[PDB]
Design a protein around this ligand. Structure first.
Ligand SMILES: NC(=O)C1=CN([C@@H]2O[C@H](COP(=O)(O)OP(=O)(O)OC[C@H]3O[C@@H](n4cnc5c(N)ncnc54)[C@H](OP(=O)(O)O)[C@@H]3O)[C@@H](O)[C@H]2O)C=CC1
Ligand SMILES: [Zn+2]
Lengths: 114, 83, 207, 94, 125, 134, 342
């Protein structure tokens, strides 16, 4: 309560920015896959864009959302230009890490993790 | 199906626990004599809503919320669990 | 006499102390807790909303020609609710004096930029953001300057582990440099070196 | 003073050797496990026990600044012989 | 202007810590115990904040102790318990607090060592 | 044999004589394939159809809350009462104390140093027994 | 169970998995990926090698400090095998060449050596021994390579019972000899095929799926006397498979009929080269052998690996065969091949 705003009067207004940033990515996946020779197809590239958004769909603070949008635009600027190469873009897909299990019994078999 | 052990929670000084604490000093002595092999695992905490947890044959726990129930009102509440 | 203890030129303590008060009553709306240290260096604490008026004043005013921005650092202090204490070191080249200006911030309380006043801030101004996550208003470019293009983090925050959360290695399965969670071969050995005795009684904090 | 373990591997002065069934022995295949053959337990014992006149005798490495910090031993014990803590030298009286 | 926000402050997504270290991790807020070998009390007075210890194993090559987590070495100091709690909740870690254990003032009198009829009489000096 | 973890290797709640629940905290991960004591019973359940409810440790503390609230209260002591009722039920039985002198097992210091699996396995404690008797 | 072998860590580098392994084909094409998946986790891979120390250089990655140990050996010379399979727990034998050399026949690379590795491992006291054959390793076959592997598969098992016989289909990958072969037919104006490629069915499998299968074969408590067949999905028709290779590699496609008797003799000519021949009489027959169905064997799904379709991971290898004006094209513009259950 009683916290100054940052580019957001209320959550709904900040949701428009997120929807503006999503339209910037969806229009951009088909240009990165070609401009830098990625091994993915555009259909599955847009899926990862959507996935990276549902990762942060539970937030409700207007200030936090604006900072998330600000970072996303920076993440988009480094991709609109080829500042970040194939090594960085393919880092989101996690094509090497072993899928960490969820079942307690599988966790119990390997490691001391909770 | 068949009751295996009861356990009761209550506070020391909380007014809500009144009736559970008045219950023990009158009716606890009689009951344990009536059911020698039925552990009534009464436990006394600091701040907690009084409860009457009951344990049955297989994995099964039925509980009540006997908060602000008079001393006699607890007598019927637990007598229900026995029968 | 005392070859070990530093010579103390007390003249420059009076001059700074007079100027700190002069700045205090010529800009009351923002100035908080001006102070002068043993080492004769002035220190002015400013409400974050007054960064532009204070920095613009201390540059243009005839009696305070602080035109050179030495640096724009940031100290993380998790103890205080407003963690990030942005620091501005300034230099005069006219009166041959250095003045520090301090404001507080927070991971959700950005601060107005200064590139309008001091263009030197521009790169320093991102360095704070890249290292501390202190968003700055009205900056032109405002992107990461130091960290990799894919750090989802802010390294200099005290809550960031020293080794980091990710390591880079080369993989033939994918024929490119990949990122995996860090598994150090020898864990960093944190040395508990603090002595249990009051080294400095002049800074005692009663309970 | 190096002794070979039953698996043929060489035991170091710290007493270590890898068991016959340990997989970590692979690193020595086609190479060698270097061990220092000048042990420290044996060499220090071969020195003679010095005899002095006082009941308290100093010990340093010998060169002064090139030795070890200046320490003082007590030689009242007769059943045992006083030992310098830094270097393993020994002292007696009489 | 100002905004109304009743939701608890929550910045877990901004710091960018992996999810594997947000839910599972446990934080301990405590005042470190005085090293009983020494009789100084300066190590105390500052609330600390460690993290739950994790697996450490001998490296197969040298016997060094190797780890798979980055948070183990991190300790943060706070002036008061309340400030530490805000940091823990603010970053989403689970926390448990151990209350301060300050020694109880004791009545030491040199004269009790030499008492005519009490049992405090010290048999030596 | 299902290897567990020692008291220095797992977060566990021990209640002492006063009734004051206290919490161990992990210092070293258990050696080899050993796992936490409560994890084995949870895993052993899942192989069968018993499927114990709680998954991680924090849920087990919730279970301890239901069984006995005092256990989860760390470094807090409950002002127990109602000793009158226990005494009244005690007097009812008609057993007679045996006419044989009662002697504690620990009469001499040599019996102190070996009283548990941990102490028995240690070689320092075995040195003390050798020194005391000799 | 020595305390060192016990697994440790969250899985990755600088970890321990107790998979001390001797891979006898690390320098090759499949061996590169097997070592990677062993070294990506915590495994001390012993890599016997006879090549130059330069050709094994690329393998000094994909493994933490001292998780690799390189030893020299000669297949003819005994007592260099035992020196390498002594302390290992699992021995992975990937030895195999697709042509005869002056010193080594197919008998001496698919039958003799696996026997020497197998006999030297059973006496040494290893727990597992993973062997690789071909899916079309029937005794009643036409290729000289496939028939020899049939005998080696039986001879390996007789000396070393409870072996794991892996039977991959034609493996495709970055530095492979399947997609990099057909794509290289452009240097001749057309792509010769037998019966235009009809009546022949291929079931290619990705290397990483194969290497994941091999790596999980040294963990799963079962699969200690079983025989697998890593085939992968989408049994294409050779005409449709090669037509698709040129679909990704935007070059051309001019198939024409060619009898197998002429197309073998021409292949036999390329086998005379002292260097690695481009084609050989034995490689002609392998490319033109229908792949049996996987019905009567466990396969990948029964082991914990998801087969990866060719369409997904074909552009990674066929990009280098494109030319400018077609290097930036994507997977969308290829009209993928048609599967056939024939
Ligand atoms: N399409 C495929 O790739 C198929 C592969 N397989 C099996 O996969 C395994 C390897 O496949 P791939 O790696 O692609 O074939 P490679 O020829 O690429 O692997 C060759 C490996 O075997 C070693 N090798 C070959 N001959 C000898 C020899 N006479 N003495 C010692 N070492 C030798 C090579 O060592 P150097 O590097 O010194 O030659 C190299 O390490 C083989 O067993 C093969 O049968 C199964 C079905 C099909
Ligand atoms: Zn000495």
């Amino acid at each position: 309560t009683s916290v100054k705003p940052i580019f957001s009067r209320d959550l709904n207004e900040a949701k428009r920015r997120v929807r503006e940033l999503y339209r910037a990515w969806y229009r951009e996946v088909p240009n990165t896959v070609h401009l830098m020779q990625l091994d993915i197809t555009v259909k599955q590239g847009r899926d990862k864009v959507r996935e990276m958004f549902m990762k942060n769909a539970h937030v409700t603070d207007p200030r936090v959302v604006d900072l998330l949008v600000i970072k996303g635009k920076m993440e988009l600027q480094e991709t609109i230009k080829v500042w970040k190469q194939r090594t960085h873009v393919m880092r989101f897909f996690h094509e090497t890490e072993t899928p960490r299990p969820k079942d307690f019994l599988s966790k119990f078999y390997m490691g001391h993790d909770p | 199906l068949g009751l295996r052990e009861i356990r009761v929670h209550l506070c020391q000084r909380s007014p809500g626990s009144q009736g559970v604490r008045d219950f023990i000093v009158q009716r606890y002595v009689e009951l344990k004599k009536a059911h020698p092999n039925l552990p009534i695992l009464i436990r006394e905490c600091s701040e907690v809503q009084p409860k009457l947890w009951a344990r049955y044959a297989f994995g099964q726990e039925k509980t009540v919320s006997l908060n602000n129930l008079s001393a006699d009102e607890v007598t019927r509440a637990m007598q229900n669990v026995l029968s | 006499k005392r070859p070990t203890v530093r010579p103390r030129s007390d003249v420059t303590h009076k001059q700074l102390s007079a100027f700190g008060e002069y700045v205090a009553e010529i800009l009351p709306k923002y100035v908080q807790q001006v102070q002068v240290s043993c080492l004769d260096e002035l220190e002015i604490c400013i409400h974050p909303d007054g960064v532009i008026p204070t920095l613009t004043f201390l540059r243009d005013h005839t009696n305070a020609q602080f035109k050179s921005l030495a640096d724009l650092t940031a100290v993380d202090v998790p103890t205080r609710q407003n963690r990030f204490e942005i620091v501005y070191n300034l230099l005069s080249l006219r009166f041959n004096s250095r003045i520090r200006v301090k404001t507080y911030a927070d991971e959700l309380t950005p601060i107005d930029s200064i590139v309008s006043v001091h263009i030197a801030a521009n790169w320093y101004e991102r360095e704070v953001w890249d290292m501390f996550g202190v968003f700055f208003f009205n900056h032109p470019d405002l992107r990461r300057i130091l960290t990799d293009y894919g750090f989802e983090g802010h390294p200099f925050r005290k809550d960031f582990p020293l080794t980091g959360y990710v390591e880079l290695r080369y993989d033939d399965e994918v024929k490119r440099v990949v990122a995996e969670p860090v598994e150090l071969a020898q864990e960093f050995r944190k040395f508990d070196l603090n002595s249990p005795w009051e080294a400095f009684p002049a800074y005692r904090q009663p309970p | 003073g190096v002794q070979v373990s039953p698996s043929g591997e060489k035991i170091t002065h710290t007493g270590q050797v890898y068991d016959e069934k340990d997989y970590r022995r692979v690193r020595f295949v086609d190479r060698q496990k270097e061990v220092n053959e000048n042990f420290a337990i044996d060499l220090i014992a071969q020195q003679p026990v010095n005899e002095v006149e006082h009941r308290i005798i100093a010990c340093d490495g010998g060169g002064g600044a090139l030795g070890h910090p200046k320490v003082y031993i007590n030689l009242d014990k007769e059943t045992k012989t006083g030992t310098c803590g830094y270097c393993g030298l020994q002292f007696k009286q009489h | 202007q100002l905004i109304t926000v009743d939701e608890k402050l929550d910045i877990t997504t901004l710091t960018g810590v992996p999810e594997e270290h947000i839910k599972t991790r446990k934080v301990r807020i405590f005042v470190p115990a005085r090293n009983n070998m020494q009789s100084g009390v300066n190590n105390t007075k500052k609330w600390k904040m460690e993290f739950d210890t994790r697996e450490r194993w001998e490296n197969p090559l040298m016997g060094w102790a190797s780890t798979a987590d980055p948070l183990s070495n991190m300790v943060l100091t706070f002036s008061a318990k309340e400030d530490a709690i805000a940091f823990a909740e603010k970053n989403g870690w689970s926390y448990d607090v151990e209350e301060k254990k300050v020694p109880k003032p004791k009545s030491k009198s040199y004269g009790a060592n030499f008492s005519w009829n009490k049992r405090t009489r010290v048999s030596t000096k | 044999i299902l290897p567990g973890a020692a008291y220095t290797e797992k977060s566990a709640t021990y209640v002492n004589t006063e009734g004051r629940a206290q919490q161990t905290k992990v210092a070293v991960t258990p050696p080899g394939l050993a796992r936490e004591d409560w994890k084995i019973i949870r895993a052993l359940s899942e192989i069968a159809g018993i499927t114990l409810p709680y998954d991680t440790l924090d849920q087990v503390r919730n279970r301890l809350e239901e069984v006995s609230p005092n256990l989860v209260r760390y470094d807090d002591i409950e002002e127990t009462n109602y000793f009158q009722q226990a005494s009244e039920l005690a007097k009812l039985v008609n057993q007679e104390v045996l006419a044989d002198p009662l002697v504690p097992p620990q009469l001499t210091i040599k019996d102190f140093y070996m009283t548990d699996s941990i102490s028995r396995a240690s070689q320092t404690m075995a040195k003390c027994v050798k020194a005391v008797t000799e | 169970l020595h305390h060192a072998v016990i697994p440790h860590g969250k899985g990755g580098r600088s970890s321990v998995s107790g998979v001390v392994a001797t891979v006898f084909g690390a320098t090759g094409f499949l061996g590169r990926y097997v070592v990677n998946h062993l070294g990506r986790m915590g495994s001390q891979v012993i890599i016997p090698y006879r090549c130059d120390v330069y050709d094994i250089m690329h393998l000094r990655l994909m493994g933490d400090l001292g998780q690799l140990t390189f030893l020299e050996w000669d297949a003819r010379d005994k007592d260099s095998i035992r020196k390498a399979v002594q302390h290992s727990n699992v021995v992975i034998n990937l030895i195999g060449r697709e042509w005869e050399t002056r010193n080594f026949d197919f008998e001496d690379v698919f039958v003799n050596i696996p026997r020497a590795i197998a006999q030297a491992s059973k006496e040494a006291g290893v727990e597992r021994f993973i062997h690789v054959s071909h899916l079309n390793a029937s005794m009643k076959s036409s290729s000289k390579s496939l028939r020899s592997k049939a005998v080696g598969e039986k001879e390996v098992r007789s000396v070393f019972p409870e072996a794991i016989i892996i039977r991959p289909s034609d493996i495709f990958g970055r530095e492979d000899r399947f997609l990099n072969h057909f794509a290289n037919y452009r240097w001749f104006l057309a792509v010769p095929l037998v019966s235009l490629g009809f009546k022949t069915v291929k079931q290619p499998v990705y290397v990483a799926d194969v290497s994941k299968g091999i790596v999980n074969a040294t963990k799963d408590p079962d699969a200690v006397g079983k025989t697998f067949a890593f085939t992968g999905p989408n049994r294409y028709l050779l005409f449709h498979l090669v037509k698709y290779i040129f679909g990704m590699t935007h070059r051309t496609f001019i198939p024409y009929p060619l009898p197998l008797f002429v197309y073998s003799w021409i292949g036999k000519l390329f086998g005379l080269s002292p260097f690695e021949p481009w084609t050989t009489k034995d490689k002609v027959e392998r490319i033109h052998i229908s792949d049996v169905m996987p019905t009567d064997l466990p396969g990948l799904e029964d082991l914990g690996v998801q087969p990866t379709p060719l369409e997904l991971k074909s552009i990674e290898v066929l990009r280098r065969h494109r030319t400018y004006r077609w290097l930036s094209s994507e997977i969308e513009e290829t009209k993928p091949a048609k599967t056939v259950n024939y």
